[PDB]
Ligand binder design. Sequence first.
Ligand SMILES: [Zn+2]
Length: 500
Amino acid sequence: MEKVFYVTTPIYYVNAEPHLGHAYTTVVADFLARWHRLDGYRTFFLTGTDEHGETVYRAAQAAGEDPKAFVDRVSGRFKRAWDLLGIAYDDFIRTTEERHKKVVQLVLKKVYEAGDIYYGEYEGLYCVSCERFYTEKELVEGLCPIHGRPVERRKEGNYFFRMEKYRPWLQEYIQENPDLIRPEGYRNEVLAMLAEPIGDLSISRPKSRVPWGIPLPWDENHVTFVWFDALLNYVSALDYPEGEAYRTFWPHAWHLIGKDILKPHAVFWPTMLKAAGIPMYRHLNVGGFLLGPDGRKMSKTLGNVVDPFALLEKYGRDALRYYLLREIPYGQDTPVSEEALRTRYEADLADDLGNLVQRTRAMLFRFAEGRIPEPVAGEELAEGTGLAGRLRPLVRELKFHVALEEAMAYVKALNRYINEKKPWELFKKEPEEARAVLYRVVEGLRIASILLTPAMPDKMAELRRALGLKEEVRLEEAERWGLAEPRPIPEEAPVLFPKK
Ligand SMILES: [Zn+2]
């Protein structure tokens, strides 16, 4: 009955410009992690950067920097992005780390000793300028997507992993574990993939061609395929196989990814785990695309790119986090825009929540001597204590938008209760009843603020302070009525959600 939660995000190309996609996935993982910690779970939230491969290496060379020095520097870009977005991760794994190198080599050794490795010839269309192979689909009308020049058929010796050997097992595993891959649409997509041969996987290239990475333990002349290397970050960060973190968190592994890297996580990864004798992960949670304002995929080409940091700068971290979690159903392609963020901010935060907090403080000073009144039963508002129980399953099923919707609906109810009861009228002849109404709203806000904490950590803590409530909270405190203590509220408090 030990409550454990482990969530990972994809480790991103280290020199990549952090974008809305990176931001969304990480914000969702952060909500999940924060929510479980709030609910008393022993939690581990992993993030990181993929720092190997020839692309990274050539980027460093082009930048005129030593490769290790290059990645040491550029990796800070993602760390900066997570700080800006208020991501409370437990570890930021960089694939250049020694512990990662050792795990990748140990796992390769295991797969090798399992007899799943063989040396073979890789043949296909090649670009001698990129120094890499390209499928006909990756080409831009038969031309290298990078140099815009024709490609040529070349061959190369690589070591291969007998991935096909595990297809029957994987197919059956997914069939017998309906909730492994969510949402369901992606599961079907993967099943379609596994209906046909998946073949063997090239897990290395000559160092002569790819000189930046982890060497194969049986052949130092070859470097491990970037995907094999990168995928293992999920267990190397737990210090597999002796780390207690591995024993603790791997049994509950949740992987969050965008649909663009589905095959590697739903096909490659599972077969690698099985071959290495490592248990399967618990859930693969697949997100959709965050489309541009015009409903089309984002691209400089189209001019519909929405910059997350531009949004964060203008409306604030919590407003952005809230918007993404409230308006983007995890798993389905959804268009985003500054206009939608602004409307959501003005309606839900500035109006519904912020102004209620403002008016409540005003009425407390006016009718309650600037203090929270003596606790009274919740009456119609007491049902707010049941929201946590209703939200737990929604969160676990990736329905963050529904969860936030329910929490905010309660916030709306608190507003109507105020307008309905009118404490300013009750005070004329029955001040005790007026104060009782004010207590109910304050206690209701306390509860609502806890439910919203995983989405807006700093703002909910600020809201709590504005009402003189206990700042640090636990989800269980949202399930009992009457915890707000009759104490004075701060003489002054900045505007929680200022107009933009
Ligand atoms: Zn090329």
